[PDB]
Amino acid sequence: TTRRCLAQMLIDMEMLSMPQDENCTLPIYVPFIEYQTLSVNTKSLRLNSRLRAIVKWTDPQLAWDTSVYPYDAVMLPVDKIWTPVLQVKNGISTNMKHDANDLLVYSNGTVNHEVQINAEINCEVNLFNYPFAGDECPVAIETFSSGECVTTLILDQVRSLDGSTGDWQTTYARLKKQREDRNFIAVGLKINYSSPLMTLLLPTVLIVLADFVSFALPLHGGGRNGFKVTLVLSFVMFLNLLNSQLPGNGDCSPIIRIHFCICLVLLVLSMLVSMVLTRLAHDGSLAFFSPVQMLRKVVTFLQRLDDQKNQNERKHAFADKLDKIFFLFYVILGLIYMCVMLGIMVAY
Amino acid sequence: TTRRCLAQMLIDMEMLSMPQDENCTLPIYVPFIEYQTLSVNTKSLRLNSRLRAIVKWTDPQLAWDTSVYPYDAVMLPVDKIWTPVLQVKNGISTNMKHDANDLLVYSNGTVNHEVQINAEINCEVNLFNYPFAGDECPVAIETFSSGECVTTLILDQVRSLDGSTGDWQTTYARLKKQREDRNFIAVGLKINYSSPLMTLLLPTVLIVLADFVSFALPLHGGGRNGFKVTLVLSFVMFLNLLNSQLPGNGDCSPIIRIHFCICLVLLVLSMLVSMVLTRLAHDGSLAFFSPVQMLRKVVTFLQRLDDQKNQNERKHAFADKLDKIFFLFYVILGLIYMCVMLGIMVAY
Amino acid sequence: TTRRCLAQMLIDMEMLSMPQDENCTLPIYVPFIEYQTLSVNTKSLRLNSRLRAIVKWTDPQLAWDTSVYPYDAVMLPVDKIWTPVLQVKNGISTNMKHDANDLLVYSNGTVNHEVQINAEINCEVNLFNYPFAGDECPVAIETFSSGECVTTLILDQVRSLDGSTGDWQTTYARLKKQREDRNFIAVGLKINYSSPLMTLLLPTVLIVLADFVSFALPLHGGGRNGFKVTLVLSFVMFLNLLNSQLPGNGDCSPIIRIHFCICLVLLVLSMLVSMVLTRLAHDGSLAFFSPVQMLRKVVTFLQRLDDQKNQNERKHAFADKLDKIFFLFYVILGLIYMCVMLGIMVAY
Amino acid sequence: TTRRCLAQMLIDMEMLSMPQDENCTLPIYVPFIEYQTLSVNTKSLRLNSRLRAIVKWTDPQLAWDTSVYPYDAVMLPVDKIWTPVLQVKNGISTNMKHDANDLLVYSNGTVNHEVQINAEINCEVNLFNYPFAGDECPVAIETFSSGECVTTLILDQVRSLDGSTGDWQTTYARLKKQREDRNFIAVGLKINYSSPLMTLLLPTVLIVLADFVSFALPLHGGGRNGFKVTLVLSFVMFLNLLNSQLPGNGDCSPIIRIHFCICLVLLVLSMLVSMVLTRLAHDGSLAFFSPVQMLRKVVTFLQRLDDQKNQNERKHAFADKLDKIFFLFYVILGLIYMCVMLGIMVAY
Amino acid sequence: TTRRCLAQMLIDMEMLSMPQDENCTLPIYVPFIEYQTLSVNTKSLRLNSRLRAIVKWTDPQLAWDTSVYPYDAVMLPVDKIWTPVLQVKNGISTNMKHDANDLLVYSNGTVNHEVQINAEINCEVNLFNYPFAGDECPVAIETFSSGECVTTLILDQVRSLDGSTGDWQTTYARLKKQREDRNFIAVGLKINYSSPLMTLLLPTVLIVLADFVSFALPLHGGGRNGFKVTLVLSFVMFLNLLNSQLPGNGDCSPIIRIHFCICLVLLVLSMLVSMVLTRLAHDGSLAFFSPVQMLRKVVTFLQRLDDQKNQNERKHAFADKLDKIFFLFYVILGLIYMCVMLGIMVAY
Ligand SMILES: *[C@@H]1O[C@H](CO)[C@@H](O)[C@H](O)[C@H]1NC(C)=O
Ligand SMILES: *[C@@H]1O[C@H](CO)[C@@H](O)[C@H](O)[C@H]1NC(C)=O
Ligand SMILES: *[C@@H]1O[C@H](CO)[C@@H](O)[C@H](O)[C@H]1NC(C)=O
Ligand SMILES: *[C@@H]1O[C@H](CO)[C@@H](O)[C@H](O)[C@H]1NC(C)=O
Ligand SMILES: *[C@@H]1O[C@H](CO)[C@@H](O)[C@H](O)[C@H]1NC(C)=O
Structure with a gap:
């Protein structure tokens, strides 16, 4: 009857597979993803970016009865259940890490969890007019989807920690959509010619x-x-x-x-x-x-x-x-x- | 009945969830946190810092009866129970590392354990008067808190290993408070213009x-x-x-x-x-x-x-x-x- | 009867050995392997390459009966079953990395799974006419095979993200064959003499x-x-x-x-x-x-x-x-x- | 009755807690610790050191009866039992690494195991007379000890691999004691002024x-x-x-x-x-x-x-x-x- | 009766201890070890080497009966059984890496498995006549041996990938013997004075x-x-x-x-x-x-x-x-x- 007892029972369930019961289609919501630029290389034209996102999905098996357990939320370790991995398919060397060791789960199966993706994107920039140059770079944000099983990713808002990253200055980070329903972030890079x-x-x-x-x-x-x-x-x-x-x-x-x-x-x-x-x-x-x-x-x-x-x-x-x-x-x-x-x- | 037997019993309990029984509010005390600067970059304005902290929290499930077990303390591996993770939300690339493989637990549930946080902070410093420059850098210390479940952090004292880190000299490290009851450390950076x-x-x-x-x-x-x-x-x-x-x-x-x-x-x-x-x-x-x-x-x-x-x-x-x-x-x-x-x- | 229940059953099978029942000969198909160059060093003549491959093999033990389980596909964690490792034997420091934490398994035992191999190859190039130089570099792709047990690798297509990697320019990446039935990729490197x-x-x-x-x-x-x-x-x-x-x-x-x-x-x-x-x-x-x-x-x-x-x-x-x-x-x-x-x- | 059977039973005991039965005081002997300098930085005044030590402690639970088991020694994996971690508290970024995967255990509970500590020490040296300079650097060797539970470390001999590490030359490495019964290694650094x-x-x-x-x-x-x-x-x-x-x-x-x-x-x-x-x-x-x-x-x-x-x-x-x-x-x-x-x- | 079933039973045996039944003396054969140089530093006189070896040992517990199981070989994951760790004791920072995730085991207990040792050796070279210089560097190959338990290493052949590594040229790599029956590799380094x-x-x-x-x-x-x-x-x-x-x-x-x-x-x-x-x-x-x-x-x-x-x-x-x-x-x-x-x- 203890909240800790409920957490322990949820751990003992060992639900390390994704909630694919509903036709193997898992809608994953990622509202308020924050983008930041760590560095820009001019010779190699490679962009280092950090994306702090707040994933929020649904896990029906991780949903208890409120009458027996009179609680509304419980925090469980990230590695004791399933968790989606977010990728930057457009760029090279994408790595997703957990901001915390614990994640919150509600009584109706909703799971909230914040992640950090560090990515290196091979940016293509029109550098003909050095230093008077500036262009838009696409950064793809994607989650795994193969064949019949597809997990759509729904994004809402992007916040940019806009500021100079050396010689280069990041101006904006907006959210756009690709052709095949792929969500991506358009990042505006400019060169401080001073x-x-x-x-x-x-x-x-x-x-x-x-x-x-x-x-x-x-x-x-x-x-x-x-x-x-x-x-x-x-x-x-x-x-x-x-x-x-x-x-x-x-x-x-x-x-x-x-x-x-x-x-x-x-x-x-x-x-x-x-x-x-x-x-x-x-x-x-x-x-x-x-x-x-x-x-x-x-x-x-x-x-x-x-x-x-x-x-x-x-x-x-x-x-x-x-x-x-x-x-x-x-x-x-x-x-x-x-x-x-x-x-x-x-x-x- | 031996102390090692008690330690093994606590290991076999497998309490890897946070002590969230009491309204999911865990007060975590971190007295005598030591701050040190590893490096300062002038071109990128990025600060590398090491914080050696002594976390001290409460775990009710890890509390035995003194009459059956005539002991007052027992040391357990850090990975065999729950442990909070301390973050530097203000800066990028924060990593928390365990100083030792063992932690002490008292008979009343109190757990003492020291950690080391290595962080890199994008510092904002007024560099107009180079080299006669110097400014105050905030470094946030935060632990996970989402929605209903919050675990407040109570900090007492800060000690700084003040000394030159290259061209830059760290002068002081004081403890201040933010608006939304957020604890942070203000670090005074100065430039040796010699x-x-x-x-x-x-x-x-x-x-x-x-x-x-x-x-x-x-x-x-x-x-x-x-x-x-x-x-x-x-x-x-x-x-x-x-x-x-x-x-x-x-x-x-x-x-x-x-x-x-x-x-x-x-x-x-x-x-x-x-x-x-x-x-x-x-x-x-x-x-x-x-x-x-x-x-x-x-x-x-x-x-x-x-x-x-x-x-x-x-x-x-x-x-x-x-x-x-x-x-x-x-x-x-x-x-x-x-x-x-x-x-x-x-x-x- | 749940698809999640089927995934859990397959996880509890714990099939961490390769499907070697059929004479210890496992045909592994890797169609549409994408090659990209990350860097080329002229002084040391060392080539950094990234190969995104789509492995597709057969696991008979991971095949359920369709009548009892009315589903055609299931996604399981990569570490809960066996997965081949792809190597670059020709070069040094080859590392295979998991693209996702899930892989798809069909009802007939077929498994689809994407991997990423990062390799560094000691390339030999006729650099007599610097900068008017250019040569073909072999990159081996192989999987473990010792003695009686061999796992043949069948490759279909290679796609190259051709583009300058600094001073050097990658022109093409074709698929050829070695003497002892070893599949390898010939990469054409050229120097932009401008x-x-x-x-x-x-x-x-x-x-x-x-x-x-x-x-x-x-x-x-x-x-x-x-x-x-x-x-x-x-x-x-x-x-x-x-x-x-x-x-x-x-x-x-x-x-x-x-x-x-x-x-x-x-x-x-x-x-x-x-x-x-x-x-x-x-x-x-x-x-x-x-x-x-x-x-x-x-x-x-x-x-x-x-x-x-x-x-x-x-x-x-x-x-x-x-x-x-x-x-x-x-x-x-x-x-x-x-x-x-x-x-x-x-x-x- | 097999020596391998004895090793398996010792592994199955799962003695992953330290031998804290005797008043939670574990005497750890580290005889013949070898010191070596990897690098010295003159600008940052930071010393990189490697210490190869031979820890030798006592584990009463890992002691069998000689009559039933007619053997005097057995080798067990390091991860299947408890092992102390040795730290360099004086310096930053201390990392202890196991030299081998196996350790020897005698019939009376004595355990022998060799470790390697890599440390970075912020050295303080009087550099007024560059290059005619040279001074003594303390390097602390310490193991975890909190409150009532203390595990004293007893050191016997230090041997140094004397030899120039670049501009700097390491002259000696002697063993001294601090105020509060803390053992440390004094390393003599000198500058080859040629x-x-x-x-x-x-x-x-x-x-x-x-x-x-x-x-x-x-x-x-x-x-x-x-x-x-x-x-x-x-x-x-x-x-x-x-x-x-x-x-x-x-x-x-x-x-x-x-x-x-x-x-x-x-x-x-x-x-x-x-x-x-x-x-x-x-x-x-x-x-x-x-x-x-x-x-x-x-x-x-x-x-x-x-x-x-x-x-x-x-x-x-x-x-x-x-x-x-x-x-x-x-x-x-x-x-x-x-x-x-x-x-x-x-x-x- | 399936070969996969035999592999599963071998995995379930859980023989993670060394085959130390026979007086704790395990002869480990390492024929045809290949040596290669990755880099040589002239200022620090440090040699970076890669050694691809083929370990072949005996595990009596991992031997089944051929009549019940009509097979001659079986493939098992490297982490599910014991495996020796090869070391470079003469040099610093030695790391042994698993070439594959699988190893072959025969019906009589023989195990074949290749490993890769990356080592950095503090070489002593007579650099008086720069650039006309050249000398022999010893590289030790050793396995753990403490007290009564000693695992002899029997080496047969060495093949070197001769080729310039920058300024330095590696001429040969022969196999010699030390005083106390220690096997080591003598590598001949020469300087291209052109x-x-x-x-x-x-x-x-x-x-x-x-x-x-x-x-x-x-x-x-x-x-x-x-x-x-x-x-x-x-x-x-x-x-x-x-x-x-x-x-x-x-x-x-x-x-x-x-x-x-x-x-x-x-x-x-x-x-x-x-x-x-x-x-x-x-x-x-x-x-x-x-x-x-x-x-x-x-x-x-x-x-x-x-x-x-x-x-x-x-x-x-x-x-x-x-x-x-x-x-x-x-x-x-x-x-x-x-x-x-x-x-x-x-x-x-
Ligand atoms: C679950 O409850 C949370 C808490 O209010 C709510 O935000 C969320 O929309 C709910 N989800 C469903 C599927 O009912
Ligand atoms: C538990 O005991 C320790 C040891 O004296 C003490 O410092 C701590 O305040 C106690 N905590 C509680 C909640 O009683
Ligand atoms: C298994 O089914 C898939 C799905 O159509 C098919 O592509 C594959 O060839 C089949 N394999 C076998 C061995 O039947
Ligand atoms: C245990 O036996 C070893 C082997 O001789 C010896 O070196 C050690 O001192 C003994 N320890 C005790 C506590 O008897
Ligand atoms: C085991 O069999 C293999 C296969 O022929 C052979 O090479 C090896 O020498 C045998 N070992 C023993 C101890 O019989």
Whole structure:
């Protein structure tokens, strides 16, 4: 007659099989399932999610008579009776664990029990515009159903612990329905571009601008070839660091990688042209690559020195003319390309 | 009749259900719960904590008669009877582990048993003033309670193994109460700024000072543009290192990131101005960007050389005047900005 | 008479041994096995795979009479009866995991049950042409069979969730057969060379081309020896980065490592000869390594100055001639070597 | 009458409670416990240890009669009887694991069984003098004891597998007793200073010596400010590397961090002074920061050039003298500081 | 009479104790044990191994009568009877895993069953000659044996899956015997020096050669001190990277560390002497460290300029002589040291 006695008798019943008597169709209600994001990986595009759900089903064999047992509820260990397992079929490595060791059972057979599902979903995201990206990820929630025996799952509400999970920010988690009456959660993922814009795009933009203005350095004065090779080996490091953390899979791959490649090529070409111009200024032609008498001798020497200085000036001015032409052309194309690349990366 | 026989009888009773006889309300006492911090993550803002608690509850069915059994205590395996599970509902990934395989039971039904809860809590900390930051983190301690059946938790004292856990230092762990009679522990986390200030803030401040002094280098003499390009590509590396370990989530994001961005922009602007001044000094105008007779001829040559030297001096002096004006302007704005930025980062 | 009663009776049968009555030969059918790649490691050449299979076998003892029990199916817990374990013998660390806690059993003894095998396979791949590489990996699927008792496994179809797993791309998963009637899955792995070509090959090619054009810098003008030492010390970093992520095992090791080594050696040789040429130009020979009168005196001084300048010019032109000869030789040899190495790395 | 029959009957007795008949006091003997260190973490100051112990206790219920059963020993599974669990109360994450599945039981009740305890101990070591450091770490060995029931643990001998565990070297492991009759193991940890010395201290000392010598570089000749900026940025990198792997907790924090900070400050000050001196030499004053006639005119020009050359020589010599005075003072201070810091780091 | 009925009766026998009837001495035969290496760590010198063994023992109680049961073999679950646990006593963290959930038992009591042992062995390797190193590692295979009860292990053959495991290459795995009749496996580990020689030794060799040839750069011309300081801060990075992956334990520590230290010291000394020679050339003495009239005056100025240029030439030649003497010393000493160190690192 004790409530503990009722619990013990229910344990001794050993009902470790599901209530499949009614045509092997068990309606399982899961109201108020709470979703949370634990991490997001950008290189692998994999989402770690935690879903705390409240399963509520019916077990007719676990229903006593109220007259003999004057109680309305009883708490039993989870492993001493049957309990459904909830799966994330869409993702890999799904694991369901029990929040508590005890579950409540009412006098009419209703069973309430809270569970936690940790899942890893191979999310597909349109990462073409890094970092200005964001997309919707489906997460399937399913319970076992094979052939004739099918246990429908009825879901009511979803609550999301929305908040940044690192670089990525989870915006919403809504409940939608699939084609074959499959319930799933649509999770909206977005990228906070405040970090990538400052750490990646801004330094490269300033570096390209510095290269554009680097043509002010005179060829003869020096401090120009080293200045540009420093930029080149810095942009190579940038390319390596960018490649270390973005997926170069296939169609709609991130376009920042191609932009870095093109900027590196442009910088290398500019440095090459600068070095060739330096040689032209120094030598005067690009042939390196291709295979009272005492009072008179003094004015002869003086005019010889003057003529030498004049030739030095002329050969230092011709290369300056060529450098000016190339600088105008290069700066125009570089600015137009940078504007086009930004317009593509933000609105395409 | 032996104590081992009594223990075996209690094992054979198989009371694996909760002592829910008295209206399904079991008061669980947890006096002297010890808290310790294992790690703190600054980027993800996640706290790993270990709580060693001493649960002490009542099991009426596990109470023998003292006259037949002349003993006052008996130790039984934890898995052979019922035991409550303690949870950290506020945080993710909570696991409760049995410290020992045995528990003590008195003759009046009281059961003493110690447990260890390892939990990971998504801590919310105001990280605006990195590294001068510190805040209070709630850690909930809860046990299962559903519907009619509730088992209240009564907590008495908290002891903290206070000590640095890396960059972060745990200051205190007090016991407070929530709204709906929920017991929780408030943990005070603080940042030891001795490490971040030396490794991060001091080198950047000294580099900025070196940039402010860098204008002393003569434009014609060289060694100025490469000197600043080294600083710029070092500050880019500093920005990357800062972005690697700080959360750029949203409002009240760390201000050191914006400070590094602004310092980098100022350095790049100083470089551009210096390079333009170098071109102006070399060429004389910013048009590169914009599209007895023997005894007399020697005097002509000498005065021509003297005039050329005078022109060289004048073009090297005009750029010096412009550089001085820009240096005064830039140094005043830089000092005022650095003072304002430190004032913001310290007391805002 | 209840279906739950039938399930309980089958549970109480306790049939935890395999149906080996028929000559200890159990045919196990596994139709529609789905293969997916989780990760591929290039340095260790290890493949992580997940195989979701649908096992379907026969258990004669688990077959009831339809007249007494008017049902066609029943779902029982997986651990209450015997279930085969599927292994990946070819690879290491194979683990079979239960998809659900229930399995369906028909009235004639047929049992349907889904399993998930996670395996890690030591894959052998011809990585000579990094990154233009691709190969077929065998994955064995087997069940326990010792001596007289054998359980043949009959497979029907394989479905692959083809898609990039990082750097590597899985193309197909077909079903083939081994010699001794062993069923296995051939998985086609390919490398997306878009990432390695941009991050590794292109910067090195551009750096090498820059080294070839660096000979334009005059010996006296400076900015040349440092320009080359930066390239050499950057190529050392490239060699380290390349070594950090590629298996240098033995025969048919990646040839990009040898190519990087040879390019570094060539750059070092070019720098050495350039520095020797600089010394020759400065000193005039490679011996450092080897152990009216007033109106006339001015003419003498002017002639001495002119002769000194003439000697400087001649000693600066001889080294220019030597540098031109070496530049022609070096450029021709380096271009032919680069073309040959690319031809080897692409189509050999 | 079979030994296997005796083992089966002992198993069937189901003695899963501890031998608490004798006043609930069980003397547990653990002779010849072997200690080994698996790893030491310098940043977190956490010790990973493995202890292979040989527990030997008494179980009166597991004692048969020799006349009926003519045997002296029997081996039983560990899980079929009671076995004590050994804990490391001082440290976190203590786990006890059975070395074998079987244990030996004698005819008089004595039970021999070997166990392995893996523990993580939060070690407190005086790391002020990195790397010349070393200290004694206590490791508690304890078994469950609550209230009236206590089971004392009697230890005899400790043997340690001495050998370097990375940077740290374990020297000894002795057995001592605490205040409240608690047995513990004192482990002597020491740092092999050869690796940290050669990788951190010697390069920094050599860099500081190079900085002290760098004053020989002439102000006008160039190649000086780039040298010092390379030194300073390399020292900042060293500061970052040092901060990445040393605990900056509080009092008696490693003093190498302060030494690196002070040396960096000194280098920056030397750079600033050198740049200001260079400007003074170039300009002549620190005001940039503060807001027959033909035969005669040639003599005028020549004396003007001579005067200008003399002024250039004087303004170079004044800066040379100032640089000499600063060099003397700076080198004296630097040598005295380096010697004092070495003395503090080695013998304080 | 059914084979399944025979298996069920064997399961119901519940023989979970070792077959210890015959003097508690059980001969366990393990023929054809296969060894494989999973990973080798160079810094910690720890070997990860997988051993797939085929245990074959005798269980007299698990033997039926052939006349009543006309069968020769039967398959039983591994957990329903006794099974030995194979251990790796020499190494840490040994785990034995069941290859299958079933085992075969013959009519005469013989039991065949394969197991998998994963072990981690603290290997002792003579790493003095890195990378030209290689040594033999013992791996113990043992079963539980305490006091009177001893289970001998009889091993027949070992087959090894030879193949590179990263940097390390496993050559052989033979079976030997210890002193006290203990069976163990000797595994031959060797280092593929193709990777370390290319990534570590060769770049340092060319860097050293570049330092030796760097003396060609003239003192006055510049581009020398920066060239050497770049090499010095590159060699410091090499020292750090080498220290990151090699064990500096004690006697017979790798000599490449000492070699890198000595090369760095030599480079620093060469840089220091070059920087001193620069000042000697510029100033003329090492005292910085130590505390018709018109037609005639023009001749006076001209001869003064000539004398000044003559003094410049003489002071630029004396330092050249000193530099030549030092270079003749230094190149010979360094070449002899490099040859001696290579001879030591190869054949000592
Ligand atoms: C069982 O009783 C509970 C308690 O009110 C109620 O919520 C539930 O709907 C009932 N279920 C059925 C099938 O009557
Ligand atoms: C049971 O006895 C213990 C031992 O003194 C005591 O601490 C506890 O308060 C008692 N509980 C009750 C309900 O009497
Ligand atoms: C058992 O019945 C199922 C259901 O139709 C069928 O698919 C299967 O082939 C049958 N097996 C045998 C052996 O009759
Ligand atoms: C039991 O016998 C063993 C075997 O000699 C002995 O070592 C041990 O001391 C004995 N213990 C007692 C309590 O007699
Ligand atoms: C048992 O029979 C098997 C099968 O031939 C044989 O290999 C084994 O040696 C036999 N063992 C004994 C003890 O007879």
